Design a protein around this ligand. Sequence first.
Ligand SMILES: *C(=C)C1=C(C)[C@@H](Cc2[nH]c(/C=C3N=C(/C=C4\NC(=O)[C@H](C)[C@H]4CC)C(C)=C\3CCC(=O)O)c(CCC(=O)O)c2C)NC1=O
Ligand SMILES: *[C@H](C)[C@H]1/C(=C/C2=NC(=C\c3[nH]c(C[C@H]4NC(=O)C(C=C)=C4C)c(C)c3CCC(=O)O)/C(CCC(=O)O)=C2C)NC(=O)[C@@H]1C
Ligand SMILES: *[C@H](C)[C@H]1/C(=C/C2=NC(=C\c3[nH]c(C[C@H]4NC(=O)C(C=C)=C4C)c(C)c3CCC(=O)O)/C(CCC(=O)O)=C2C)NC(=O)[C@@H]1C
Ligand SMILES: *[C@H](C)[C@H]1/C(=C/C2=NC(=C\c3[nH]c(C[C@H]4NC(=O)C(C=C)=C4C)c(C)c3CCC(=O)O)/C(CCC(=O)O)=C2C)NC(=O)[C@@H]1C
Ligand SMILES: CCC1=C(C)/C(=C/C2=NC(=C\c3[nH]c(/C=C4\NC(=O)[C@H](C)[C@H]4CC)c(C)c3CCC(=O)O)/C(CCC(=O)O)=C2C)NC1=O
Ligand SMILES: CCC1=C(C)/C(=C/C2=NC(=C\c3[nH]c(/C=C4\NC(=O)[C@H](C)[C@H]4CC)c(C)c3CCC(=O)O)/C(CCC(=O)O)=C2C)NC1=O
Ligand SMILES: CCC1=C(C)/C(=C/C2=NC(=C\c3[nH]c(/C=C4\NC(=O)[C@H](C)[C@H]4CC)c(C)c3CCC(=O)O)/C(CCC(=O)O)=C2C)NC1=O
Ligand SMILES: CCC1=C(C)/C(=C/C2=NC(=C\c3[nH]c(/C=C4\NC(=O)[C@H](C)[C@H]4CC)c(C)c3CCC(=O)O)/C(CCC(=O)O)=C2C)NC1=O
Ligand SMILES: CCC1=C(C)/C(=C/C2=NC(=C\c3[nH]c(/C=C4\NC(=O)[C@H](C)[C@H]4CC)c(C)c3CCC(=O)O)/C(CCC(=O)O)=C2C)NC1=O
Lengths: 103, 160, 92, 161, 161, 161, 206, 160, 160, 177
Amino acid sequence: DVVNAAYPKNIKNKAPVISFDGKKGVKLEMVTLQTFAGDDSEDTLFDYSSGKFMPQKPADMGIAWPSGDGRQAEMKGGKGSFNQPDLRKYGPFPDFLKRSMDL
Amino acid sequence: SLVTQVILSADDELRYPTAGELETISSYLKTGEYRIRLISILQGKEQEIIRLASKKIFQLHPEYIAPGGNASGARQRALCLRDYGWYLRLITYAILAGDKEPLEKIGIIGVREMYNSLGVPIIGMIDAIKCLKEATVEVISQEEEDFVAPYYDYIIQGMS
Amino acid sequence: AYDMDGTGAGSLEPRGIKSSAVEKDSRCFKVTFVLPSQSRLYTFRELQNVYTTKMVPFSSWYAEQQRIQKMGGKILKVELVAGGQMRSVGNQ
Amino acid sequence: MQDAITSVINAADVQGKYLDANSVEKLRGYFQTGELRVRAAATIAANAATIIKEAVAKSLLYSDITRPGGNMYTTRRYAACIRDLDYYLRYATYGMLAGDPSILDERVLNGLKETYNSLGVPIGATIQAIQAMKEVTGSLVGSDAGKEMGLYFDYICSGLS
Amino acid sequence: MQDAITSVINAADVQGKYLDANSVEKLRGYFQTGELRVRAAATIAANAATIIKEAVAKSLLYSDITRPGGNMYTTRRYAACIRDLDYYLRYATYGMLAGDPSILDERVLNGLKETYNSLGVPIGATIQAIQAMKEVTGSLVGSDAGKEMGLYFDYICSGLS
Amino acid sequence: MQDAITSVINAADVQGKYLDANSVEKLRGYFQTGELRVRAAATIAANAATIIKEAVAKSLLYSDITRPGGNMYTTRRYAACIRDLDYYLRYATYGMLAGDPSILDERVLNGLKETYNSLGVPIGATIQAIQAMKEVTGSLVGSDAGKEMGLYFDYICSGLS
Amino acid sequence: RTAYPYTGSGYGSAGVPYGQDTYGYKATTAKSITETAAQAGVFNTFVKLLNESGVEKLVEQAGPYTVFAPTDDAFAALLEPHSFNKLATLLRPENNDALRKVLMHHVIPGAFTSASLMDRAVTVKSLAGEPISIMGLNKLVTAGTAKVVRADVPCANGCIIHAVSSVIIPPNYVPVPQPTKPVFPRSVIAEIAKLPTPRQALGLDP
Amino acid sequence: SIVTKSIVNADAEARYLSPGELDRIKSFVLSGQRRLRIAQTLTENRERIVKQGGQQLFQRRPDVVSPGGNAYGEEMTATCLRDLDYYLRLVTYGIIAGDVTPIEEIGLVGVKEMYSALGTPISGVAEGIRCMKDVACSLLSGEDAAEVGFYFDYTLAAMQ
Amino acid sequence: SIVTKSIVNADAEARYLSPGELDRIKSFVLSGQRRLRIAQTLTENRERIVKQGGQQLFQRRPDVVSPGGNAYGEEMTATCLRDLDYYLRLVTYGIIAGDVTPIEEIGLVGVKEMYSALGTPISGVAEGIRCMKDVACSLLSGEDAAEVGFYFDYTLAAMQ
Amino acid sequence: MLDAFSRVVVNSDAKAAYVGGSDLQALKSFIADGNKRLDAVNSIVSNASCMVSDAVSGMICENPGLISPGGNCYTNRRMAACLRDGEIILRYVSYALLAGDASVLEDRCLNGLKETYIALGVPTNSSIRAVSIMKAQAVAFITNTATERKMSFAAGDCTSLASEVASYFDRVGAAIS
Ligand SMILES: *C(=C)C1=C(C)[C@@H](Cc2[nH]c(/C=C3N=C(/C=C4\NC(=O)[C@H](C)[C@H]4CC)C(C)=C\3CCC(=O)O)c(CCC(=O)O)c2C)NC1=O
Ligand SMILES: *[C@H](C)[C@H]1/C(=C/C2=NC(=C\c3[nH]c(C[C@H]4NC(=O)C(C=C)=C4C)c(C)c3CCC(=O)O)/C(CCC(=O)O)=C2C)NC(=O)[C@@H]1C
Ligand SMILES: *[C@H](C)[C@H]1/C(=C/C2=NC(=C\c3[nH]c(C[C@H]4NC(=O)C(C=C)=C4C)c(C)c3CCC(=O)O)/C(CCC(=O)O)=C2C)NC(=O)[C@@H]1C
Ligand SMILES: *[C@H](C)[C@H]1/C(=C/C2=NC(=C\c3[nH]c(C[C@H]4NC(=O)C(C=C)=C4C)c(C)c3CCC(=O)O)/C(CCC(=O)O)=C2C)NC(=O)[C@@H]1C
Ligand SMILES: CCC1=C(C)/C(=C/C2=NC(=C\c3[nH]c(/C=C4\NC(=O)[C@H](C)[C@H]4CC)c(C)c3CCC(=O)O)/C(CCC(=O)O)=C2C)NC1=O
Ligand SMILES: CCC1=C(C)/C(=C/C2=NC(=C\c3[nH]c(/C=C4\NC(=O)[C@H](C)[C@H]4CC)c(C)c3CCC(=O)O)/C(CCC(=O)O)=C2C)NC1=O
Ligand SMILES: CCC1=C(C)/C(=C/C2=NC(=C\c3[nH]c(/C=C4\NC(=O)[C@H](C)[C@H]4CC)c(C)c3CCC(=O)O)/C(CCC(=O)O)=C2C)NC1=O
Ligand SMILES: CCC1=C(C)/C(=C/C2=NC(=C\c3[nH]c(/C=C4\NC(=O)[C@H](C)[C@H]4CC)c(C)c3CCC(=O)O)/C(CCC(=O)O)=C2C)NC1=O
Ligand SMILES: CCC1=C(C)/C(=C/C2=NC(=C\c3[nH]c(/C=C4\NC(=O)[C@H](C)[C@H]4CC)c(C)c3CCC(=O)O)/C(CCC(=O)O)=C2C)NC1=O
């Protein structure tokens, strides 16, 4: 959170850096003295991309082919009216084949 | 669907779809919602219709219901309405994608060997679909039932 | 001779598979694929194994690879076992 | 090999459901764009040779793959390109009509990047040819139709990458 | 493709020696069961369709592989099963007559489990179908003949696993 | 499949330059030995069966691969050898004429050691057979011609190893 | 009963199926060059330098190659006081030019397994274009200054991968100079005075 | 036509015609009244559609008519317009047949062999048909110009 | 070359090379001294053989260089001569290989697809090679001009 | 070493000039101070042959029980391995100084080093002395305040690279403690 209204826009001034240059006066300085930073965040304020850009592939659907049949995983709406239950259930399978339901 | 038949049928000749085929896609897509409006009419009458299908498939064929027949017993008759439910569900697919492949890639291709390994008389299932088409006429007006009539008798032609 | 005489659209022999194979080509692949028949249930022919791995020539890999997907096949792996790459002369 | 209607049916069908109102939004949505796709596939069929001639002249016949040693030097190798680019512009037309990119990976994408590595075909120059071919295709069919035809070009470029 | 006599002759030939007392000792053991195997293969030929109808109804007829989504859903897919189960009951009959399971892996087992993984066919339900098919086969041919025919069923189930 | 002239033209073409003095310098070196290679390939064609009969009798004729259990026992297996050794003496003749061993790995070497491991063919006995076959080939064609024909035999033996 | 049995069926068979597993022509299981190395977990800088430098397209190809991919300890061993002179300049982002040849010196056309180097010394040039001498003597193989660590890795297109201990620099490779200042002569009269006149060349003047 | 290849499609597949095939033969014959009107417009406009067709063709390709061009002189220019009268005629057949099947086996199959063997630039004759297309679609409304132009560009596609 | 396809011929036939094949590899390598002299003449005459080659090409085909021609302007005309430098180079390969095998898989296989796809008149580039042939055979004696011209006309044949 | 700055690929047939789909933004940004970093690693690895021998002999002459017989550096195999491991550690800081982050150091050099040195009986209290000499040696060399050797750099500042490389050496020194 930005809770530093205690620290304004005079945080890191570092007032006591002191250079004597011999026996005379202490030459007080307020040099800011940044870190070995790098500010680790992703997706910054602009795009920075010339096209050279076709990187997008769909995720792997297992053994079938991608997006061809994610049909077991779908939102769907209605079931039917009679619909006898399964009573053995044999595991949920996964993918159906190089194949589809419309054969 | 119908566009899939045009993309496939144009793909084995290594050419784009011709002038006539693009009509066949364009005319099919302009009659789009009317299939969509029609299937919602039939989905609201699936409990309507399969109850009427069990009316006449069994008064016509009491051999199957009687003790000894395949459909004798409760749980045998229980799925009996389920097969009507899947068929009626398939026809809503066929009425939408304006062709026979959802009635053919499912349901028709190899149906006899399925039933013959089950004991269901394959002639009886033909009358079951003919019974199902007889039942759909009552809950449907004259305008749209001849739209759905050619999708039923394809199933009868497929089963023989 | 080779399959690129000048044939394209609107030409007398029918529009078909055109391979970039030279005169008497000697490059051949090692392919692997399954190809379910999708026609046995109305023909009722005997069954044959559909998972094959064989050496197809470069002269006719493209036709075969174009056809293996025609009937819903899936190509698991192909390689160029025999022949060079970027070779101007010597594919013969 | 499924179109938008086949994919909608299937997701209705693999789980065994009927066709419920929410599923039809894409369909009442696919039939609305049915008029746009045919005219898009109409002009692409007409300007097939012109589009491919524009893409190669705009992307790669300008970099030493065209010169000796490059991947496209000999006339057999050059002729294979426009044969090869014809499929990308053709199969993308099929995806634009079917409204589903299932035909691409079924008949184009599978074993494709594994094949170009065998031949030693540069995948980098291939995608930029398709990107340039996507750029000219948006010229002909318009903006939104180019958005549709362009949506399957980068699908090829993504999987081919 | 070797029977019990072919395998006995091969091992006795591969050392270049004649058929000694041990080689003929197994051959006499095979000829003793020659009468049992033919009658076992006799009834299995008669009740081929009945055995497969009994196995599928007893193992995977009602559980979820059959319901939409599972697999045997479509009629092409269901019809492929009884076609597929026919080979297991048929080739097992050949192994029961030949007295050697060499024909199974030669013509059935090789590329089989690698093929079902491609199609996505459940190997778990497949073996239980063959196990149920093995159970009904012991009904027809008797106990010891069922022990013989059953000895090649689990050979298929073992390698197919 | 490139000869010495094809390989010289390829390297001179792959840089897009003409045939300079260095490219023609090797080509002149190949034309000088053109007279030697034909006479070498002449006598090898005449004594093809005699050379293979000499190699097998000198390397692996009486070893226990020849006896029962060895890798060469049955007559089908023995007959496969002289069929197999004929290719090595034949394809080596092609490399001797073409002056480039590209044909060997194109048509012999690839999938060869991977095939013998499948069949269980002993690679150790195979290479001497070729070494003994190389020894008799130096008898016929002479010293330098044997040096040429011998230069492709060990190329087979090296890659087959 | 002989130990080296064989394959096949029918009579004249040893009880072992064809190909030891009933497959005559076995589909391969290896990956290609760069992701056989990606799975190894040791060639991380090698596969990354290939991807950035564009050399990775070259060793994608199906030609039988013999890669001498150095493990990243070899790349980590590039902090020689000596080798850092001739190789640190490549860290600059414009010097991708030399990075491709220096990486292209590690690709050898042909499939040279270590068993094929039984006390044999054979040279060859890379795909960079300059000769490299592979030497295998006394069960220790060498590729220039390689001192190969891992023997061979079977790859996709009949290619081989050997793990080396260092990075082979090409023979006639000169390191690129650091970026400098284009300097110009301040005066013009300090240079006419720098050129010897004709009367000077004949010794007519001092 | 759409009737003959919807038959030979279902002919090869050992089956009858689906609703997808029979609801389009039905949809095509009700379209037949509108097709004859469209072909009737191009029938007695061949004087302008051809002569203005060769108008833009020579302005866009003066090489073919210049001395050395294939259609040079009073003779070849007459035949130069004769081919455009041919292809304009085949488009009238395709409009009434509802497909480029008449245009396919006449003027399209092996057309590159003829024009290459006649010395004619095949790209030049493609430019001629495009010039006829702008004249033809300028004679009809928007609903019709999406058809009459639709058959020309197929001829443009196959002619290169 | 004659060496590589005399091998792959006898390679396919499961046999060695006959005297008919080995008395010609023999006859070709003794011909090799005379072949390099012929190719050496065309090697450093490309300045005249190409520039005078494009000389007669433009005088015989001014359309291709006129405004609208494919090789119009300072740019295309430079590439207009670049292709002639290519095909003149391949003829030097065919003379040294003793066959059009180098010319076959470079500049001949699928050449019509390239030039049709570039908009270039393929007949025009055939005219260019014929103009180079008269310049090339004018640089050699009669015994040589029956060879150097012999490879050009093969390129003329395959280029149409 | 060569993954520490990303390069650009300009020629064709690459798959990264066209279908790269990215430019490496985290490592372009490190050629924005790249010459000053490359002089700093050159300040270490031109003295890395001398920094490891001074530091290992530094902890010998402060804790003399290691070269006593019975100690962990008396025999020749152990004395060669102790000079090897400081050289390997000084290389891996010089990777992490070059790449600008410590993510190379913690898994290839520090992951499983404290379990190794207690599995061999290596004195962990003395090995952290051996890297604190190299912590103090490296900040003299990067700031060019070494007493016996200077190098001719450009005119500028190299603090916040010296404190960057001093933050890696205790990161080593607590991973073995
Ligand atoms: C024995 C008890 C004992 C030593 C041995 C010696 C080791 C030592 N040195 C330092 C500090 C530095 N060492 C440096 C290394 C070198 N200086 C050079 O010029 C050459 C190139 C190289 C040695 C081969 C440097 C640069 C320093 C920093 C001081 C300086 O500017 O020179 C320490 C650590 C001291 C501390 O941490 O403060 C040790 C232990 N010293 C011994 O006492
Ligand atoms: C305590 C922390 C120290 C210590 C301090 C003493 N310094 C003494 C004298 C002295 N100190 C300085 C330096 C200081 N004075 C300045 O004016 C300036 C800046 C210009 C600085 C940095 C000087 C110059 C002197 C005078 C020396 C001389 O006479 O030549 C001192 C003596 C007493 C006093 O003068 O106050 C003390 C005790 N000395 C120590 O021992 C501890 C460690
Ligand atoms: C830091 C610890 C030093 C110091 C560093 C500076 N170096 C500056 C510029 C510079 N450095 C190099 C060498 C470096 N760059 C490379 O590409 C390679 C390898 C090939 C190395 C070793 C060069 C070539 C340059 C540019 C030369 C110039 O233009 O003058 C520099 C100024 C630029 C900047 O800060 O970005 C600094 C500060 N200088 C020091 O004082 C400390 C001791
Ligand atoms: C010297 C400063 C130390 C000391 C060192 C010894 N280390 C010994 C073995 C050893 N060290 C490592 C870690 C090193 N190897 C690596 O690969 C990496 C990072 C990439 C590092 C830091 C390992 C893994 C091993 C065991 C395997 C090997 O021998 O290399 C060692 C030998 C022990 C013995 O033989 O008894 C010594 C003496 N020990 C000391 O007392 C000082 C403090
Ligand atoms: C989507 C297409 C599709 C269909 C149709 C299908 C049918 C099907 N019907 C079955 C059984 C059965 N089906 C019947 C059917 C009938 N009895 C009658 O009198 C009638 C005419 C008829 C029903 C209308 C009977 C009696 C059985 C049980 C037979 C037995 O197991 O003893 C079974 C075995 C398991 C089960 O009931 O779920 C299947 C899989 N599967 C499919 O995937
Ligand atoms: C329908 C899906 C599908 C695709 C895409 C396909 C590609 C395919 N591209 C091929 C070759 C090729 N492809 C190219 C292409 C190119 N060179 C370049 O520099 C460019 C980057 C690129 C043009 C965009 C070339 C030059 C060859 C010939 C390679 C050779 O002769 O070695 C070949 C070898 C056989 C032949 O062309 O006859 C196949 C099979 N096959 C398919 O079934
Ligand atoms: C003679 C040795 C041999 C065997 C065994 C064999 C199997 C084989 N089974 C197949 C398919 C199939 N197999 C099944 C089987 C099943 N589904 C289930 O849920 C059950 C667990 C199982 C029945 C026991 C199904 C449903 C298909 C169709 C898959 C599809 O359409 O994607 C196919 C694809 C092609 C086709 O059927 O025409 C082959 C080749 N081939 C052979 O040569
Ligand atoms: C129904 C389909 C069909 C077509 C298209 C057809 C074409 C055809 N065009 C011909 C000639 C010709 N065609 C042209 C054409 C042209 N010159 C140009 O500059 C233009 C680019 C182009 C016209 C737009 C010329 C100049 C000739 C005469 C060529 C000669 O005399 O050598 C001839 C030989 C003379 C004749 O019998 O008419 C035929 C058969 N025949 C057919 O059955
Ligand atoms: C070795 C076999 C071989 C050939 C022949 C070849 C031809 C070739 N010709 C080209 C262009 C061209 N070629 C021409 C040619 C001509 N214009 C005319 O009027 C004349 C009829 C004709 C020349 C005699 C023109 C004008 C272009 C540029 C076309 C444009 O910019 O659109 C290009 C594209 C630019 C380039 O990369 O050079 C190639 C690749 N490549 C090969 O590898």
